[PDB]
């Protein structure tokens, strides 16, 4: 139950679906059409959560009907070990400023704030500006 | 002259088919009476070019001109069996059998030849004679062949005993004598239980039917066969106890859990087992839950549709989409199919949407959503829903094919061809059309041919409705070509199917000798029956029936008369993407010569119909296709025949029958272009058995309104019968404008998919 495998650019559409499903305006479509650190969470053959990293947490999502079953945080641990094994101690992520609920509980893991809003980090799908927030951890 | 002959052979063997046949055709003009080693060479050549009837004569002449090679008898036996000349093949078996008595295969061959010639006794004597000669000398390698030849000898005896209990006892004795040497225990047990049933010893048969079930409790056949042996065939109160007692021996197998659902008539109890078969499945989330219970929705919908609806709905009512997500999503998936089968499309979308937005990661949910959209008439949307599903996993070869199907059904042949090319072996080619023809992928070429026929009719109307009032002319020259291009490919892909099934008929050539040396005569006889049904299989008749629309039209349009070449780069480059066969084998890449034919009826006959008609049986014979074919070739005495045979079966109340009679009865007029002798015969035949059905006397009355007769005799609801008349409006004018409108008003009860296609193509 709640297993994790890789993407393998055969089922990249899986990942692109989970990123386009949960919080998708920002999620560009040329983004995942380059990649071929990726990892997806499976719930008895059901893809449920995804993770895209850069070396930074570039995306971490889980299906709303399979959250809170410890599943998103399992993807978080995979990112920490990845950092620990690339001889670096900096794991960071950019988040929208209106995203407060995916912060308080999401910052349960040591992830401290760099200091106020950044303004227009990235344009989404429409093309408008989107205030952003930066938090980071250490290995 | 033997030099001009063997050259072709040597020539043929390398690959140059052209001069290979060109050489050989002089070597036969030369003689008119050749050397045996020359007749042998050409017999080997005619066999390779699949000229069996001529190969037999060059092989028969080789011996007639003095030959020593006694293998010509086996070579003649294989070839003669291929053309169905088993009277002459028995002669060849006897001759080769005499020449090599040491090989058991030649005994089995001689026997099989006798068996099919009706000489059932000579076959048994032949096999028995070898049995007695080889007593105590069957080695371990030969034990399989010995087991087959014994079961085969029991097959002949059993078919010769018919229902004679005196003899049926002796075939039972032989079966129990050979049993220690027979390894086909399943077939021996299957045979034994049939004799016990024919012998009336139903108690003994019930013991075998129970042994068979134990050897395979997933086989529905032995379960219900056991019922007849017990006599409880019509006792639901004793069938309930039977399967209940079988539910303990085999509690994982479905026959004990499913067969009760076909006879229980008490709602309370029937609903209990219904709950026991589909609820554990929805618990495990097995996607085929509805597909396993759908037969009940077709044979006894009225008493199983609503009781399953309550069971599943109540089940889902107490489901948590957090907590129990696997059973939650797969119960919505069931309920979506439950309502889709009931044509309750609003609820059908209602239950698939939840499962999808809850779990948009299982491709099954996409196929079902795309399946409902195709029922609604949104082919291009349904195709889009499926391309989303295949984006989830590009390795799934199953979703690709389902996706390729939906793109072909939406006439998107370009997306379809290239989605399919992701799994084909292209190599030194562009797409996968030539590879799909190599692997005999009939699922693709039929769907693509039907798509081309749809695209041809769509661009045809775009030609007529734009020709009705500069570039608005060279643009006509582009569409004038697209209509000829899609019509040819539609017909060139349809003609690719008989090429496959004649290969299936040539593929049994090697088995006339191989099955004998392998010692599988019983499985070989099943191959001869299989070869005599190849042109009746669903894929062959689907291509034939669909291609008849083109051939029949080409004859019907034949009725009333139907800075120059600097664009060939458009045609020459596009011919590289539609090529089906190697360039060294096909020059009519666009079927250009198929659509410009001057004998459309004889092309359809020698490419599809003749081989089908000769093999099809009355049970499954298409009589409407028979009528429509003989009508366009003159045989009116075969049109009433099909209509009479169609009548034997479907009641004189069918609206299709009435339309066929009206069209035929109208051909019995003096102004019609038919043979007056057949006209007189068909008139007599129409009076003899259908005088109390139609006002035959009023075919001469030019003021009789037959549409009004149809209306009052068959209603305005029989869509298919109205469409048949509308097909023959040029030969039988009865108010085409009034007929068209009445067809349109009868489309209200059909689903939007069937209405759209009737309006867009059938009218």
């Amino acid at each position: 139950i709640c297993t994790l495998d890789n993407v393998y650019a055969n089922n990249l559409g899986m990942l692109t679906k989970l990123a386009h499903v949960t919080v998708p305006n920002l999620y560009q479509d040329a983004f995942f059409s380059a990649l071929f650190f990726t990892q997806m969470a499976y719930y008895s053959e059901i893809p449920v959560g995804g993770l895209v990293a850069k070396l930074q947490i570039e995306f971490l999502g889980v299906l709303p009907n399979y959250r809170h079953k410890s599943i998103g945080s399992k993807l978080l641990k995979f990112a920490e070990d990845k950092c620990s094994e690339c001889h670096q101690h900096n794991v960071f992520v950019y988040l929208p400023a209106v995203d407060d609920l995916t912060k308080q509980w999401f910052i349960a893991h040591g992830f401290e704030q760099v200091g106020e809003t950044v303004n227009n980090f990235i344009k989404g799908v429409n093309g408008d500006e989107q205030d952003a927030i930066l938090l980071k951890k250490h290995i | 002259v033997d030099s001009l002959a063997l050259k072709g052979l040597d020539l043929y063997s390398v690959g140059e088919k052209d001069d290979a046949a060109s050489y050989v055709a002089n070597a036969i003009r030369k003689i008119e009476s050749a050397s045996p080693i020359c007749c042998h060479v050409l017999g080997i050549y005619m066999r390779n070019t699949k000229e069996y009837k001529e190969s037999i004569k060059w092989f028969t002449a080789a011996l007639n001109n003095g030959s020593t090679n006694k293998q010509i008898y086996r070579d003649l036996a294989t070839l003669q069996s291929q053309i169905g000349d088993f009277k002459s093949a028995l002669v060849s078996r006897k001759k080769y059998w005499e020449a090599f008595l040491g090989y058991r295969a030649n005994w089995t061959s001689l026997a099989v030849a006798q068996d099919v010639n009706g000489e059932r006794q000579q076959a048994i004597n032949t096999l028995s004679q070898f049995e007695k000669l080889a007593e105590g000398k069957i080695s371990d390698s030969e034990k399989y062949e010995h087991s087959e030849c014994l079961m085969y000898k029991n097959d002949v005896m059993y078919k010769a005993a018919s229902d004679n209990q005196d003899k049926l006892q002796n075939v039972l004795k032989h079966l129990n004598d050979i049993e220690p040497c027979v390894f086909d225990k399943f077939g021996l047990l299957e045979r034994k239980a049939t004799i016990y049933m024919k012998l009336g010893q139903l108690k003994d048969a019930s013991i075998v039917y129970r042994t068979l079930i134990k050897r395979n409790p997933d086989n529905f056949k032995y379960y219900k066969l056991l019922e007849v042996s017990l006599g409880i065939q019509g006792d639901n109160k004793l069938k309930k106890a039977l399967y209940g007692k079988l539910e303990q021996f085999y509690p994982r197998c479905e026959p004990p859990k499913f067969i009760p659902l076909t006879f229980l008539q008490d709602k309370e109890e029937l609903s209990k087992k219904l709950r026991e078969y589909v609820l554990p499945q929805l618990k495990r989330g097995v996607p085929a839950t509805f597909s396993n219970v759908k037969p009940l929705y077709q044979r006894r919908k009225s008493k199983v549709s609503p009781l399953l609806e309550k069971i599943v709905l109540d089940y889902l009512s107490g489901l948590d989409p957090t907590q129990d997500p696997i059973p939650f999503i797969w119960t919505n998936y069931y309920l979506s199919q439950h309502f889709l089968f009931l044509k309750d499309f609003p609820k059908a979308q209602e239950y698939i949407d939840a499962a999808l937005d809850h779990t948009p990661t299982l491709v099954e949910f996409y196929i079902l959503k795309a399946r409902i959209l195709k029922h609604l008439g949104l082919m291009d949307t349904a195709a889009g829903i499926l391309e989303e599903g295949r984006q989830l996993d590009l390795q799934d070869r199953f979703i690709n094919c389902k996706t390729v199907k939906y793109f072909l059904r939406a006439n998107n042949i370009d997306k379809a061809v290239e989605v399919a090319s992701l799994f084909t072996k292209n190599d030194d080619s562009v797409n996968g059309i030539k590879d799909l023809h190599l692997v005999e992928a009939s699922w693709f070429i039929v769907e693509q041919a039907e798509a081309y026929y749809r695209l041809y009719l769509d661009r045809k109307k775009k030609l007529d409705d734009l020709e009705s009032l500069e570039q608005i002319a060279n643009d006509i020259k582009e569409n004038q070509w697209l209509v000829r291009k899609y019509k040819g490919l539609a017909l060139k892909r349809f003609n690719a199917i008989p090429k496959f099934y004649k290969q299936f008929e040539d593929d049994q050539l090697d088995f006339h000798s191989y099955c004998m040396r392998k010692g599988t005569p019983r499985a070989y006889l099943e191959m001869l029956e299989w070869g005599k049904a190849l042109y009746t299989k669903p894929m062959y008749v689907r291509a034939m029936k669909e291609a008849s629309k083109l051939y029949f039209q080409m004859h019907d349009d034949r009725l009333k008369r139907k800075e120059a070449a600097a664009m060939n780069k458009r045609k020459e480059t596009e011919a590289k993407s539609v090529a089906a066969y190697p360039s060294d084998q096909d020059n009519d890449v666009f079927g250009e010569k198929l659509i410009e034919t001057s004998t459309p009826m004889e092309d359809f006959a020698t490419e599809f119909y003749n081989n089908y008609s000769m093999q099809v049986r009355e049970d499954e014979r298409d009589y409407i296709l028979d009528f429509e074919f003989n009508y366009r070739i003159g045989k009116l005495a075969l049109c009433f025949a099909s209509l009479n045979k169609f009548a034997k079966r479907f009641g004189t109340t069918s609206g299709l029958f009435g339309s066929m009679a009206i069209v035929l009865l109208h051909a019995t007029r003096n102004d019609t272009p038919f043979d007056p002798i057949l006209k007189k015969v068909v008139t007599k035949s129409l009076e003899k058995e259908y005088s109390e059905n139609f006002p035959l006397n009023e075919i001469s009355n030019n003021s009789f309104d037959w549409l009004n007769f149809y209306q009052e005799k068959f209603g305005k609801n029989d869509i298919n019968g109205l469409l048949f008349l509308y097909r023959y409006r040029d030969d039988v004018p009865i108010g085409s404008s009034n007929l068209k409108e009445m067809i349109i008003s009868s489309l209200s009860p059909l689903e939007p998919h069937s209405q759209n296609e009737i309006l867009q193509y059938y009218l």
């Binding site: - | 399989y144 390894f183 086909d184 225990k185 399943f186 013991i207 129970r210 134990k214 050897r215 395979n216 997933d218 086989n219 529905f220 056949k221 017990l230 004793l238 039977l242 007692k245 021996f249 085999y250 509690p251 994982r252 076909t262 006879f263 989330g285 996607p287 085929a288 597909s291 396993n292 037969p295 009940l296 044979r299 006894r300 099954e364 070869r397 199953f398 799994f423 692997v439 005999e440 009939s442 699922w443 496959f500 290969q503 299936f504 593929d507 088995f511 191989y514 392998k518 019983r522 499985a523 070989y524 099943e526 191959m527 299989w530 049904a533 669903p538 894929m539 008749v541 029936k545 499954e620």
Partner: protein, 199 residues
């Protein structure tokens, strides 16, 4: 429901279609004939059923073996032909539909094939090859069918993937189908004895 029976020549046309929609290795009709006419008691198929409770005719679908009968899976079995050892079988090809997972179709088809391979042809063992990437196949043959992994056969398929050469010795007593009719044990293992009356 799903019916499971022996394969006949009248099944191979639909078998080819099933293989063309599922598996990457495709064969000509002549190859299926060479299987079903050389070893006509080894191959098994899994189909749907429509038992009488009206009637119907056959649908012009590439999957219809008979009216109301749809092919969902098959197993193409054969003895070793290649030229010097004891008798041994070989699973040439196995395919089961995606929507008919989680019903034991794959397992049921293989058990009949393994039993028929030992009883009819007296095979000492049966060999096959599995793609390493396919984890669902490794769990089927090895973990539930008691197969054993032998070699690795790096780059065995034409695409470049590494196979899983597996083999299983065949003993009629262990392959008996009546051995795997129950799951949760302990409990009473009630089975038929072919003697007492069922009524």
């Amino acid at each position: 429901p799903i019916n499971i029976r022996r394969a006949t020549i009248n099944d191979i046309i639909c078998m080819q279609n099933a293989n063309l929609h599922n598996l990457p290795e495709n064969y000509m009709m002549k190859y299926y004939m060479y299987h079903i006419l050389s070893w006509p008691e080894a191959s098994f198929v899994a189909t749907t059923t429509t038992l009488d409770c009206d009637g119907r005719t056959i649908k012009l679908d590439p999957t219809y073996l008979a009216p109301g009968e749809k092919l969902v899976g098959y197993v193409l079995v054969k003895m070793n032909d290649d030229p010097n050892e004891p008798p041994n079988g070989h699973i040439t090809s196995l395919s089961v539909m995606r929507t008919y997972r989680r019903m034991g179709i794959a397992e049921n088809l293989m058990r009949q094939a393994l039993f028929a391979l030992r009883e009819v042809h007296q095979a000492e063992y049966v060999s096959l090859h599995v793609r390493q990437s396919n984890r669902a196949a490794l769990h089927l043959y090895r973990d539930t069918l008691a197969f054993e992994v032998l070699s690795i056969e790096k780059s065995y398929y034409q695409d470049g993937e590494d196979a899983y050469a597996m083999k299983k010795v065949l003993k009629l007593e262990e392959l008996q189908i009546s051995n795997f009719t129950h799951r949760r044990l302990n409990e009473e293992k009630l089975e038929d004895d072919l003697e007492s009356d069922l009524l």
